Amino acid sequence: FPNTISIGGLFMRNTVQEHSAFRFAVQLYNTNQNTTEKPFHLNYHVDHLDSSNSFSVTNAFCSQFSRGVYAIFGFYDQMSMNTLTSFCGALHTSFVTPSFPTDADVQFVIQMRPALKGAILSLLSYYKWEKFVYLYDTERGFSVLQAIMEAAVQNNWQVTARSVGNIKDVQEFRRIIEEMDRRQEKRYLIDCEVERINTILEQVVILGKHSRGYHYMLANLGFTDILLERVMHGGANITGFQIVNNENPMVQQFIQRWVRLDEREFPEAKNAPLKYTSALTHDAILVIAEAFRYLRRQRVDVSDCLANPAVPWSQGIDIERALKMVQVQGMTGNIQFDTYGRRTNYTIDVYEMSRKAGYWNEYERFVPFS
Amino acid sequence: FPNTISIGGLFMRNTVQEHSAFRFAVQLYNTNNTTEKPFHLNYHVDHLDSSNSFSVTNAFCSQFSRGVYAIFGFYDQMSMNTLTSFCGALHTSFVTPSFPTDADVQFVIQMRPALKGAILSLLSYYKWEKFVYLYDTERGFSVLQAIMEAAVQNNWQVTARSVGNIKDVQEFRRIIEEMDRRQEKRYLIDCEVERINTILEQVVILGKHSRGYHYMLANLGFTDILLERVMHGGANITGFQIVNNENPMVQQFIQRWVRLDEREFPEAKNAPLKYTSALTHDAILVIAEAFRYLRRQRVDVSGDCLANPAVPWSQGIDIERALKMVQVQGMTGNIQFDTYGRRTNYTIDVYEMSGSRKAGYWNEYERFVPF
Ligand SMILES: *[C@@H]1O[C@H](CO)[C@@H](O)[C@H](O)[C@H]1NC(C)=O
């Protein structure tokens, strides 16, 4: 079994903190005082993608594939997802990612981010939301959008859906809200990126008269990066979701070390709050280390991109299977995967604003406190 | 200038006739007048079992490595971004009868003319201010946006439904029944052919949906649409074609086409000529004309997808420019392109259907001329 295991890193625009968390988590793997948990040296090479254009992406992936990495950590967006997942599946190279989980059932993709739709549907049912507005963009896929479409037909809900992903004019959010007032709409599910949630919420405040009596359910695991003090002042209910529990001592002890790190060597660790995607990045390194320690224990053997007679990687299958079978405790709770690399047996914490109102998991569904 | 010019062929699922038309058109270029055939035209074909990005990239690059001077092929909504991206980065001209793209890209010659101008003209000519618009997204969003914009700005009552994902024929019935409750008699259907046939079968089976109804079928594959059962009930049907049967070039092509052996050229005897096989024929005319042009200008023409050194600014530019500047007569009328490889100065024939008369023609300057 090798002395060194090398992994790839594919990073996008605006993943600076995650890059830092990645470098730091690897360093924690390598400086562990316990020799049993560190039987090989963990090493890496990183590429940054200026864009998600298909050529740029393929070039980057193949340069790393050619170096001989044993797995690849990285990010995709709506534009690059299909290229990365397709090359990984064809070349048997496991891609570990904290990006949004895919719609399709693919091989060789470990999705660190749990799905939200189960929790969202449970809370729609628990709050009895049978008439509501659903503002969405497509940047985290279509998974939630379709679950909501299907449930609306099946339950006879009046959902007014509006696709806000392309709006560059903040005045146009106002025109949408004013329209929804004419229909008496007080309940809003907002399935957007964080920055767009903040934009939308600023318009709610500035426009005015849109707090007391209203309820915004924010379907995004980046709850703690959402600026929502101005909306709460008016009296609005807000429901949110998190997967990082701050009272968890593992998170606490990680944070303690994290905030001491130098601004040059590890940017966005002092000056910025910990994003949930940097927590998933930390947990990706736990999962990768655990899988390779497992392979060493099983005594499994491990060792050109655009070949026309493309030769499959023999050992890739064991690496995939090893990553999928890990059970580890991380900053995002219990971490396990099903056969399509999706998180299973996870917990989503539900926040009502500022108490934790309950938790959701796959078996119990939504359990409220009190 | 070389003895042989080689081209690539990228074919997808359900392009068997087009593959035959491609092989046949090349053969007609090569067996011609010595002046119109100063080099031998040669090709290598790959088939894409799927439109997954690796399968597509591997196919494109294998052909790029052989040293082809252009690539003929197809894309779909899934593969468009991969192909247009690799074409632009490697300066390799992609000639295609697939749907024209939304974005303005380089190195892509789009044989299929746009429909939206013609559709909007006929909506205005028939005075359609209240109608249903059933659509899928497989030919791009060009038509969908034109209709959204025109509905706002003309004060139309358009009821739009996106039917691209429906695999349950029962669900088309629920949609039509809903539109009866609003008194809707006029339907614009912007779908693939097979889905148009599905939809139309439901119209018949459901029944009482012909006499006072009007279906405008926004799809150039008009002659593959099964519409006899709908017409018998008395429904008006409007359609569009770009292949004119009275054109002697089409007639003489058909004459030869239907005599071709079933083994060597499948789907030429047993199946009607699809408009995409006509565009495939015209692609070979365009390619031959461009390379004859380059030989006449005395332009020089002669590795690998990973750009270790990379593609210099000046490579493939002559070939791009040559393909874009051709003016030729083909099975689909006058063929010219603008700077983004889009058809310009084209004509669309409009058909009204017992009855089956050509009701008029549409072009960019005159708009719809009714006869
Ligand atoms: C327009 O196209 C026609 C052929 O259909 C041709 O007679 C004429 O030269 C073209 N004009 C321009 C400006 O391309």
mmCIF file of N, CA and C in Angstrom, chain B residues 78-135:
data_model
loop_
_atom_site.group_PDB
_atom_site.id
_atom_site.type_symbol
_atom_site.label_atom_id
_atom_site.label_comp_id
_atom_site.label_asym_id
_atom_site.label_seq_id
_atom_site.Cartn_x
_atom_site.Cartn_y
_atom_site.Cartn_z
ATOM 1 N N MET B 78 -28.762 18.511 -24.741
ATOM 2 C CA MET B 78 -27.699 18.028 -23.848
ATOM 3 C C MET B 78 -26.263 18.203 -24.339
ATOM 4 N N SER B 79 -26.029 18.100 -25.645
ATOM 5 C CA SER B 79 -24.676 18.079 -26.201
ATOM 6 C C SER B 79 -24.243 19.389 -26.858
ATOM 7 N N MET B 80 -25.169 20.331 -27.002
ATOM 8 C CA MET B 80 -24.924 21.591 -27.700
ATOM 9 C C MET B 80 -23.734 22.343 -27.113
ATOM 10 N N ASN B 81 -23.736 22.550 -25.798
ATOM 11 C CA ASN B 81 -22.690 23.317 -25.133
ATOM 12 C C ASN B 81 -21.315 22.678 -25.255
ATOM 13 N N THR B 82 -21.210 21.361 -25.106
ATOM 14 C CA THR B 82 -19.928 20.658 -25.336
ATOM 15 C C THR B 82 -19.407 20.875 -26.774
ATOM 16 N N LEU B 83 -20.244 20.623 -27.782
ATOM 17 C CA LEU B 83 -19.787 20.714 -29.163
ATOM 18 C C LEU B 83 -19.422 22.142 -29.560
ATOM 19 N N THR B 84 -20.220 23.134 -29.178
ATOM 20 C CA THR B 84 -19.962 24.512 -29.602
ATOM 21 C C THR B 84 -18.746 25.063 -28.891
ATOM 22 N N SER B 85 -18.522 24.602 -27.672
ATOM 23 C CA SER B 85 -17.351 24.987 -26.886
ATOM 24 C C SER B 85 -16.025 24.434 -27.421
ATOM 25 N N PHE B 86 -15.990 23.145 -27.738
ATOM 26 C CA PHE B 86 -14.825 22.539 -28.376
ATOM 27 C C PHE B 86 -14.572 23.067 -29.784
ATOM 28 N N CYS B 87 -15.621 23.332 -30.550
ATOM 29 C CA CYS B 87 -15.452 23.922 -31.885
ATOM 30 C C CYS B 87 -14.819 25.275 -31.872
ATOM 31 N N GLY B 88 -15.272 26.112 -30.936
ATOM 32 C CA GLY B 88 -14.757 27.459 -30.779
ATOM 33 C C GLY B 88 -13.355 27.483 -30.244
ATOM 34 N N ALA B 89 -13.009 26.552 -29.372
ATOM 35 C CA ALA B 89 -11.679 26.556 -28.759
ATOM 36 C C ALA B 89 -10.638 26.013 -29.726
ATOM 37 N N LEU B 90 -11.005 25.019 -30.524
ATOM 38 C CA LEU B 90 -10.080 24.413 -31.487
ATOM 39 C C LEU B 90 -10.204 24.938 -32.933
ATOM 40 N N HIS B 91 -11.045 25.948 -33.144
ATOM 41 C CA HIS B 91 -11.162 26.614 -34.448
ATOM 42 C C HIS B 91 -11.560 25.630 -35.559
ATOM 43 N N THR B 92 -12.385 24.657 -35.189
ATOM 44 C CA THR B 92 -12.828 23.628 -36.092
ATOM 45 C C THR B 92 -14.281 23.848 -36.423
ATOM 46 N N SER B 93 -14.562 24.052 -37.706
ATOM 47 C CA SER B 93 -15.903 24.399 -38.129
ATOM 48 C C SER B 93 -16.814 23.199 -38.038
ATOM 49 N N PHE B 94 -17.945 23.404 -37.372
ATOM 50 C CA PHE B 94 -18.974 22.378 -37.198
ATOM 51 C C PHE B 94 -20.170 22.722 -38.112
ATOM 52 N N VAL B 95 -20.461 21.905 -39.110
ATOM 53 C CA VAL B 95 -21.620 22.171 -39.989
ATOM 54 C C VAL B 95 -22.767 21.263 -39.578
ATOM 55 N N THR B 96 -23.962 21.805 -39.347
ATOM 56 C CA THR B 96 -25.030 21.069 -38.633
ATOM 57 C C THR B 96 -26.444 21.386 -39.126
ATOM 58 N N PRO B 97 -27.306 20.381 -39.212
ATOM 59 C CA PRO B 97 -28.707 20.672 -39.502
ATOM 60 C C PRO B 97 -29.575 20.671 -38.263
ATOM 61 N N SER B 98 -28.968 20.563 -37.090
ATOM 62 C CA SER B 98 -29.685 20.684 -35.827
ATOM 63 C C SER B 98 -30.230 22.072 -35.591
ATOM 64 N N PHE B 99 -30.986 22.211 -34.505
ATOM 65 C CA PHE B 99 -31.667 23.442 -34.232
ATOM 66 C C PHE B 99 -30.670 24.575 -34.093
ATOM 67 N N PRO B 100 -30.995 25.759 -34.648
ATOM 68 C CA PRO B 100 -30.082 26.887 -34.455
ATOM 69 C C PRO B 100 -30.041 27.354 -33.020
ATOM 70 N N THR B 101 -28.841 27.730 -32.595
ATOM 71 C CA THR B 101 -28.562 28.062 -31.207
ATOM 72 C C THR B 101 -29.144 29.420 -30.841
ATOM 73 N N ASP B 102 -29.290 29.620 -29.540
ATOM 74 C CA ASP B 102 -29.780 30.879 -28.984
ATOM 75 C C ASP B 102 -28.622 31.882 -29.017
ATOM 76 N N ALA B 103 -27.522 31.492 -28.373
ATOM 77 C CA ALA B 103 -26.306 32.287 -28.316
ATOM 78 C C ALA B 103 -25.677 32.485 -29.684
ATOM 79 N N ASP B 104 -24.994 33.611 -29.850
ATOM 80 C CA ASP B 104 -24.188 33.901 -31.024
ATOM 81 C C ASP B 104 -22.800 33.284 -30.843
ATOM 82 N N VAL B 105 -22.533 32.170 -31.526
ATOM 83 C CA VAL B 105 -21.249 31.490 -31.393
ATOM 84 C C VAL B 105 -20.456 31.535 -32.686
ATOM 85 N N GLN B 106 -19.165 31.267 -32.551
ATOM 86 C CA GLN B 106 -18.261 31.149 -33.674
ATOM 87 C C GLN B 106 -18.058 29.684 -34.024
ATOM 88 N N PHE B 107 -17.713 29.447 -35.292
ATOM 89 C CA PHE B 107 -17.345 28.124 -35.842
ATOM 90 C C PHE B 107 -18.498 27.129 -35.928
ATOM 91 N N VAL B 108 -19.714 27.615 -36.131
ATOM 92 C CA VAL B 108 -20.852 26.724 -36.226
ATOM 93 C C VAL B 108 -21.731 27.187 -37.382
ATOM 94 N N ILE B 109 -21.865 26.350 -38.404
ATOM 95 C CA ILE B 109 -22.687 26.690 -39.552
ATOM 96 C C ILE B 109 -24.017 25.981 -39.415
ATOM 97 N N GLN B 110 -25.079 26.768 -39.239
ATOM 98 C CA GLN B 110 -26.386 26.232 -38.897
ATOM 99 C C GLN B 110 -27.256 26.163 -40.129
ATOM 100 N N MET B 111 -27.394 24.970 -40.706
ATOM 101 C CA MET B 111 -28.176 24.780 -41.933
ATOM 102 C C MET B 111 -29.674 25.035 -41.776
ATOM 103 N N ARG B 112 -30.239 24.812 -40.606
ATOM 104 C CA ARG B 112 -31.679 24.998 -40.390
ATOM 105 C C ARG B 112 -32.124 26.453 -40.174
ATOM 106 N N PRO B 113 -32.997 26.978 -41.031
ATOM 107 C CA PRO B 113 -33.444 28.346 -40.772
ATOM 108 C C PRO B 113 -34.322 28.470 -39.528
ATOM 109 N N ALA B 114 -34.355 29.662 -38.945
ATOM 110 C CA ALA B 114 -35.238 29.930 -37.819
ATOM 111 C C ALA B 114 -36.700 29.988 -38.263
ATOM 112 N N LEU B 115 -37.574 29.560 -37.362
ATOM 113 C CA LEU B 115 -39.017 29.592 -37.539
ATOM 114 C C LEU B 115 -39.757 30.838 -36.991
ATOM 115 N N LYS B 116 -39.185 31.566 -36.030
ATOM 116 C CA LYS B 116 -40.020 32.498 -35.225
ATOM 117 C C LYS B 116 -40.654 33.636 -36.022
ATOM 118 N N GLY B 117 -39.934 34.112 -37.028
ATOM 119 C CA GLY B 117 -40.436 35.165 -37.885
ATOM 120 C C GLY B 117 -41.681 34.723 -38.629
ATOM 121 N N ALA B 118 -41.650 33.506 -39.159
ATOM 122 C CA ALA B 118 -42.740 32.943 -39.915
ATOM 123 C C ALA B 118 -43.939 32.680 -39.021
ATOM 124 N N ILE B 119 -43.692 32.104 -37.862
ATOM 125 C CA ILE B 119 -44.771 31.855 -36.914
ATOM 126 C C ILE B 119 -45.483 33.140 -36.476
ATOM 127 N N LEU B 120 -44.711 34.182 -36.136
ATOM 128 C CA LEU B 120 -45.302 35.448 -35.716
ATOM 129 C C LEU B 120 -46.095 36.105 -36.834
ATOM 130 N N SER B 121 -45.602 36.010 -38.069
ATOM 131 C CA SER B 121 -46.342 36.522 -39.219
ATOM 132 C C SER B 121 -47.698 35.856 -39.392
ATOM 133 N N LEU B 122 -47.747 34.538 -39.242
ATOM 134 C CA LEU B 122 -49.009 33.853 -39.397
ATOM 135 C C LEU B 122 -49.960 34.026 -38.225
ATOM 136 N N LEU B 123 -49.436 34.199 -37.017
ATOM 137 C CA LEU B 123 -50.291 34.545 -35.897
ATOM 138 C C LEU B 123 -50.953 35.888 -36.184
ATOM 139 N N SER B 124 -50.194 36.832 -36.728
ATOM 140 C CA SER B 124 -50.759 38.148 -37.031
ATOM 141 C C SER B 124 -51.726 38.090 -38.232
ATOM 142 N N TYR B 125 -51.367 37.350 -39.282
ATOM 143 C CA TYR B 125 -52.208 37.223 -40.483
ATOM 144 C C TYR B 125 -53.561 36.541 -40.227
ATOM 145 N N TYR B 126 -53.582 35.502 -39.399
ATOM 146 C CA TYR B 126 -54.831 34.884 -38.932
ATOM 147 C C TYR B 126 -55.512 35.600 -37.762
ATOM 148 N N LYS B 127 -54.923 36.694 -37.282
ATOM 149 C CA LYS B 127 -55.466 37.490 -36.176
ATOM 150 C C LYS B 127 -55.644 36.716 -34.871
ATOM 151 N N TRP B 128 -54.709 35.825 -34.560
ATOM 152 C CA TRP B 128 -54.777 35.029 -33.325
ATOM 153 C C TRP B 128 -54.421 35.882 -32.113
ATOM 154 N N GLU B 129 -55.420 36.332 -31.369
ATOM 155 C CA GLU B 129 -55.149 37.097 -30.150
ATOM 156 C C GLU B 129 -55.426 36.301 -28.879
ATOM 157 N N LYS B 130 -56.026 35.135 -29.037
ATOM 158 C CA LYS B 130 -56.293 34.280 -27.903
ATOM 159 C C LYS B 130 -56.047 32.868 -28.361
ATOM 160 N N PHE B 131 -55.054 32.201 -27.767
ATOM 161 C CA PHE B 131 -54.696 30.841 -28.161
ATOM 162 C C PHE B 131 -53.847 30.106 -27.151
ATOM 163 N N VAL B 132 -53.746 28.797 -27.352
ATOM 164 C CA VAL B 132 -52.960 27.919 -26.494
ATOM 165 C C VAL B 132 -51.639 27.687 -27.163
ATOM 166 N N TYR B 133 -50.597 27.590 -26.363
ATOM 167 C CA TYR B 133 -49.265 27.401 -26.890
ATOM 168 C C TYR B 133 -48.623 26.257 -26.136
ATOM 169 N N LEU B 134 -48.572 25.103 -26.794
ATOM 170 C CA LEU B 134 -47.974 23.915 -26.220
ATOM 171 C C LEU B 134 -46.563 23.816 -26.758
ATOM 172 N N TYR B 135 -45.581 23.638 -25.879
ATOM 173 C CA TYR B 135 -44.180 23.629 -26.319
ATOM 174 C C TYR B 135 -43.302 22.674 -25.534
#
